[PDB]
Structures are given as structure tokens and as C-alpha cells.
RNA sequence: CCUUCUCAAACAUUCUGUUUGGUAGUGAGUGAUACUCUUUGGAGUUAACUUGAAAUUGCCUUAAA
């Protein structure tokens, strides 16, 4: 979880203040006297379930605590269907922090800088081994039989 | 419990520090023996960074100079090696946020390159020295009757008489004289004020103090660089500005 | 006779040939006329000045370019099966059909008029042993190149699609939708099969 | 394959036009003089609050 | 001075050995092409394994036809320039094309020291980056830092290991000092390493380049600079695993042993 | 069943016997630790073996470190069955060159060089090459 | 329907570097930053040419 | 979960030229005859190629709580 965020923190969507100051810098320079497309985490449920099924998702992070639970119930199994390497991470607040929002429910990482590419591919393989392989029994077994 | 990541990080950083210290050790040994046949450079540069940050590049003269070495805490994951334990024991700078006066000669300067990632150096002014001694000062001597390890304060001048006296030193201002001007009694009084106890920067973990530590922590790597090469130019900084922050 | 290559190493092997055979006059045959609109854009972009022939372009262009290939010395064209019927040039050494053909029987008549070979992992003269190490490392360069032009994203889109549509409208037992799309996409350089 | 065969738009590859709209709105605001540029905002505080 | 007649006879025997009785060129073409001139000595740099490339001055460029018809070859020839952190902030690729298309050389990619330690720090990404390029150029300062940033596999060849180029006019960076030194390294110099052992081959490259009369001038000047600077033992011209061609043979250097 | 001896692979660049003993000591009292290294130069092959005095301690360490993302490559740990002990892995340092040279006289090696050189000219003639001098 | 200062200066750059080779003009990453077609370019340039000489 | 030895002289000013010195590298494997030394042991070299940083055992503490 800490290692997923050590990557995900490098792609904070440009906050409202940062975007405002930069786009006034564009105006103050370009009006008087080339850039690549920048990469950020992708964070709406309409947009994540858009990105997944279009296979534009390499790592989809799903919150475990959602206000109506029914919202995000299809998502882990739709990710297993599409072949999208997903990880159910703990905390919608903790996802919220990396994305300028209070809460996010979902966070995705479509494209990446090449410096972070190998780390992301290994993050996929670590999550496949740590999450998907340890929890193959979780598609079975009704939870909550605690005496 | 010690995490795995930290325990590998310590070794991975000390690998760089052991190899770095050995590298500087070789070039400084080969510089002294006059066997300058095939090395990087056979002379000594000093970098003086002032304040918009101008990097000067001036060669070190043979002249004896006066430095005030200040302890930093750096770098991150490093454990200090044997060659660092030795020099920092001799300068009595085991404690973080701690200063000392030494004269800089052709023997002192090679040892300065070893401890440069741990210390921040510079030539102080008369006010930096004089205000530092009249604000901070320790004297290790006997207590009431039995206890020895009391370090109290430079409150008096009669204490100065009892401990120094016959060398020509009578008062605290006379100690300031033999420290600012390089004289006979400098080796006498330098080990009398053993080290100084500078307060740390910002000095808190909280709301304002974390953000102020963040601002200063990014100001560190701008106002100080780790050269890591055997021909590392010694970074000299303004001590008048730095001790304005630390007093 | 033939070369055995996977759908990943298909266009990889083709591109490896065209650079070394710049001096010669070789012929590449495709099934679709919407596949050549992709290849004759990539190779002109990566500076192997090939010629373009398909049904979707005008007749005066189709005549005045193919005429130039006949009068050339060093040239190379990309043309389909159906468009190159009846107008064959003797100035040739390699007749290399890339896609599976229209008629499995009429292709024999296409040859004996030049050296013939095919490409088949999912599916006389001699076979050709092929080194795995000396393929050109222009794939990730093409993967970056596809997702940053749009025009070449669209021509690759209708390159991959038209090729695979023609692959399904075949008649043989060999060519009947067996090839997986996780390999065929990387021929046109994709992360997902469009 | 992905579920739908929707053609990808030009705007997913081309530099954004919403960004261009905002920039060319602030440009007007600087010509009019109602937004003071970021370069002069330093000069307004270098002279004041001393 | 070495006999030029024996050099002509050597290359003629190399022509005969290359004219002897698959769809890709895996090994057959390299063993056909690759000439190497061996230079032997009693312990070259006997105790220090430094990675300096000795820039042996040659009258005629072999890199030029190496460009012209590596354009035909599958492995392309592309010119790399490793610079320092202020240089790319100062100088673009377009200025390099402005001043180097005049003679006709092309800078492929300019690379910062930052890029080798962040984006090309992944091992497969690093290996596949450098192995693409044949001419590796590096500004004097960064050269000493480069065994760590690009690793050991980049140093196992002679192509992939960098050449120290001066870009500083009295420590200040100038474009002109780069512009003329790139020319001198390219057309007037052949790089070769110095191992801690005895044997050293000089990668002259493809036999097909610079008609054999020119190859004599190449070999002549190489010997004119390697026997003058160092006392040496033996010289052999060799295409990959031929019966060797003994060219120079000395009996006065061994007397000191 | 299983045994106290453990196999660890995919080790970080600079994770040696010092840190294998120190970190896995926190799991409990380890018996004997090794790490396979190159002999040409003293550095890790990125895999090693260590043994615990307790078999149950071996399986607990395996449960907690089987997929552990640790500075660019995830640790792989495997238990061993009864037998297959830790045998022959030596601490190899950086091996240095030793200068064995002259001993023989200059006139011996000169005529040895003459013998090898004249046979060298008599070697090209064996396979289709004629070369003067 | 006239043209803006920035649009005019953009078409100045395209004409001065290329001229009339619309294939090369639209495959240029530096000047045709918006990946526009040939028809858009010839229409906009003729608007630029009618308002100028 | 730290990030890597980011330049010096001697001579020369053609708007920067010449010369001198500076780098110890992830591991594992495939590999076609040559080089000297050693006396039998490989010692050290010499093309090239494979690879998600891959792998089964060669005899200081305010960088804290």
C-alpha cells in the first residue's frame, strides 16, 4: 500500500491553485513574447469504469469503505474480467489525499513517465502475487461467520 | 523492530561513504608525498557560496585561517565510518547542533574534506565570535566538593583566572581575544570552552514548524552540495548569516 | 518458399528486409487496400521511400506512380493482390506476399512469370531459417509514434481491422480465425486490440 | 478486445482547447488590466509591507 | 617506418579470405566485415583498469561511410551527445543541425546526466537505449561519473563506451568548442580502449570501407602513433578468426624484461 | 514435511550476510547464514540461504516475506523439505592480480618468440593463404 | 470574418518554413501542434493570402 | 526506499587551439581462433550475443511522537 502510493504521489493532479498560476504564466508570457501531454492519476467512477473496458488501465485502485457499498461491487470482478490488474486499497480518504479531493472511491493509472514505467510494471506484478493470488479464495467463501 | 528497507538503505549509503572516504584518502595521500604523476588535480579549491546564489571558485592559500565548524546531521541513511568517528572525536562533535573553533592549515584542510558531508564550515566575523561566547559557553570543572562532571556556564571571570590565569588570560573577553586573533593561548582556551551548544533551526514538529522545516530542508540542498569526488571543493558559507539564525 | 514468423515478429521481419534491400526491386502483397494505406505511411515516415498502390486512390495517380516503378532502377512499391493483376514487371527479385492470398490455387500462376515466400505460424521452393536476435529494435519507437499522431492511429486502426476482416472472409481450413489478437495488435503496435 | 469500437477523438492526441480558451481569456484580462501579471505581483510586495 | 608493401599484401590476402563460397545476417556478415588490427605489449596499463579511449589520429574518416551505408544496414548509426545540466537549458538540437549539416553529420539525440539516472535507469531500458547507438559522446565533466550511470554492459564494447569531448572555453561553455571537437573526434580520430593485460585489438571496422589503398594509410598512421607513444611487442592484422597476418615484430623491447 | 533451512532469492543490490543475519534475527535465533557470490569480483549473485534453529520460525518468515517489494525487486522466499542442507557457499572478496612475470632469461623467450613467429608464417600456408616474410 | 493576431502569425510560420507542401506541413510537430488536416490549412492560408499580398 | 567520483593544469588566443592527467562496472549464461606470461594451474587479455535488477547451494536521533 505504501509502495503503491510512493508511485501514485508522483502523479498528483495539478491542484486548482497550481493550474491557475501556471495558466496565468502562459498568458503573461505568450501574449507579449511544444509541451508533451502530462500524466496524472484518473479518479472518477464514470471515468475509471470507462478506462477499464477500453483497457486503458494498468492499475486500478479501489476503496474498501464506500457510503453505498452497492456502488463499487461490480468493479473488482469487472477488472478480473477485462484483465486489468486491480488492487482494493484501504481508505477512500487515503485515495482522496493523492487526488485533491476529500474522497475518490477509485484511482487509476493509465499512462506513465518512462522513469516510473518499470516500477509500475513491478507494482502490477507485486499486486498480482500479493493480492490476486492470496485472495483466490475470496471469490468463494461467505464472510462474517465470526462467533 | 527494524524494517528491511531501512537496513538495506544504511548499507547502500555507507557503501557510497566508505568508497568516497577511501577515494579522498588516496588522492590526499598522493598529494602530500609529491607523487603527482597521474591524479585528477594536485591542488586545493575552496567554494564560497553567498547571497541569486553565486558559486565562487578560489584556490586555498598556505595562510593559516580561522574557521567555525558547525554540525549539520547529513546525509540520511548513513552510519559514520572509522575515519569519521576519529576526526569527529578529535573535534569533539559527536552531538548534533554543536560548534567548535579550529585554525585551518595545510594539515587541517585534508581532514576537512572527510567530514564535509557532516559539517558546515566558514570564516566567522568578530561579532559572530564575540556574541557566541557571551551567549553560549561551557566549563567542565568540579562542583561543590565531590562531583566532577558539571559543565555549567561562563558567568564569571574569576573562574577564568583559576583555570587559565598564568598564561596571561584573566577574563572572558581575553578568551575572545585569543580566539579571534591566532595567538599562544588559543590551544589553551579552545579546549576550555570545549564545544558550543547551538540551538537547532525551527525546533519543532507541528503546524507551523513542519512547514518551516520543509522550507528550510529544501533550502539545504541549494545552499550546500555533496561533491563526492576526490577533488571536492570545500564549501564555505556565511557564518554571520547562519549564526544570526542560530542565536 | 516460406518464412515462419509470429504475429508480433511479422511486420518486424518485413521492416528488417526493406532497409537492407533498398538497392533492389521487391514486391509486397497485402490482402486489404486499407492495410497498404498504413504501411506506405510508416515506411515513408521512417524514411524508406516506398510507393503506394490501392483501390481507394484515384486512377491517374495509380497509373502515374506504377509507370514510375517500371522505369525505375532502385525502387520499391506496396500494392494489393487484386490491383497488381495483369500488369506484372520482370524487374524483380523478391515476390513476397505478406497476407494470406485470395485464391490458394491462382497464386501458383502469379509466381511463374523473382523469388516467392509466405509468412505462416497459424498456417516447390525451400523454407528459410530465421535468426531471432537480429530483428530491428523499432517497436517501442513505433508504439510511441502511433499514440502521438492521430492520422497514423486511424490508418493503423483501419489497417488492423481490414486485415482481420479479410482474414475471416477466407475459404481454407488453415485460415479460419485461430490467430489470437494479443499478437496481431503489436504488428500494428497496440496495447489493446483496438 | 474492449467492449465498444468507439473511434478515439482528435482532442485525445491534440493539445487541449479548453486550456486554450482559459489562456486566451486571461490574455484579454491582462490587456484590459484587470488581472495584474505574476511578474508584477512580486513588485507590488517588494515596495509594500516594509 | 613500417613497409607499405606488406600492408597491401596483407589486405589482398584479406580480400581473398573474405571472397569465400538464412535470410538475416546474424554472423556471416560480421565475420565478413569486421577487421581488427592487433597490438601487443608487455603489460599495457599493468595495474590500473581505467576506461579511457585513446583517440588515435587518422587522415581519413571511416565513420562517414559507416553512416552512409549503415543507412542500408539493419543496425543504424546514430550520434549520441551526453551533456551537462546547464547545456540543454542553453543549447537545442536545431543549432547542432544548423552547424553540422554544413559538412553532413547528424546529432540524433542529446542526453542529460539526469536522464541516465531516472528514465534510463531500468536495466532493460538502459541496455536497449545504448545498444541502439554506435557513437557515444560525453562532455569532459560527466565522463568520470558515467561508469555508474550507464553500467558495465555499456563498457564491454568499444562503440558504447563514451568519448571525452571538451565543451568549455576557460570553464565557460561555448557551442563552438563543441562544434569543432565533434568534427575532430568523428573524422580525424579512431577510439580504442587500453586493457590491463597484454593484447589489444583496434576495431577498424568493416573491410568494405575505404578502398584497400586507403586502408594502408589507416594502418600506417595507427602504427605511427602506437609505437611512438608506447614501446610495443607485436602487430597483427586479423579478420575474425583468420590465420593471423604478422605485420610488425620487435626484438629490442623484450631485452628490458 | 518442511525444514528450518530457507531459500531467499531476488535480493536487493547490497543486501548481504550482515543484513540477512540482522533482519532475520528479529524473526528469531538463526543458526547459519550464507550468500552466493562471484569470484572474479566480490559481489552478490542476488540469492542466498539461511537456516533457523526452529522449523516453525522458518515457515513464519516464509508467510511474511514471500512477495515483498523491496527497492525495485520483490523478495522470493521458499522453505526446504527434510534434507537439502546449506553446503558450500563461501565469502568471496574482490580478488586481486598477482605479478608473476620475468623468471626466464630474455634470450630463452626471444628464440621462443622466433619459434612461434616462424611457425606462425608456416601456419597461414596450411589453409589457402600465402604471405611473404 | 477576419483572423486574429496569433492565428495570422501561426500561418506566417507555416508558409515561411514550408510554402505549399501540405503533407509535410501537417506532419510537422513543431508548427502544426494541433494535428489538423490539409484542407483546414489551405483554406486558412488562402484567407491569410487574400488579406495580404 | 539513500541515489551515484557533474573538472583541473602546461603551453597557445585562430572569438578556443594543442598537450597532459582524471571512471574499479547487477548477476547469470551462449559463444566461433588469437594473444603473451607461467610451467600445468588458468593468470590476464581479444569479436559478439541473450536478459521484466532474471537467480537451488563453483574449496549523528527534533529524519520524532
mmCIF file of C-alpha atoms in Angstrom, chain D residues 10-13 17 19 23 28 32 35-37 46:
data_model
loop_
_atom_site.group_PDB
_atom_site.id
_atom_site.type_symbol
_atom_site.label_atom_id
_atom_site.label_comp_id
_atom_site.label_asym_id
_atom_site.label_seq_id
_atom_site.Cartn_x
_atom_site.Cartn_y
_atom_site.Cartn_z
ATOM 1 C CA UNK D 10 -8.602 14.128 -32.148
ATOM 2 C CA UNK D 11 -8.644 16.035 -28.822
ATOM 3 C CA UNK D 12 -7.174 12.962 -27.018
ATOM 4 C CA UNK D 13 -3.938 13.479 -29.004
ATOM 5 C CA UNK D 17 -8.745 23.644 -26.478
ATOM 6 C CA UNK D 19 -6.896 25.186 -21.818
ATOM 7 C CA UNK D 23 -5.416 31.146 -21.535
ATOM 8 C CA UNK D 28 -7.817 39.623 -22.538
ATOM 9 C CA UNK D 32 -7.729 45.245 -20.141
ATOM 10 C CA UNK D 35 -5.554 40.798 -13.878
ATOM 11 C CA UNK D 36 -2.124 42.049 -12.782
ATOM 12 C CA UNK D 37 0.547 39.606 -14.186
ATOM 13 C CA UNK D 46 8.679 44.434 -2.785
#
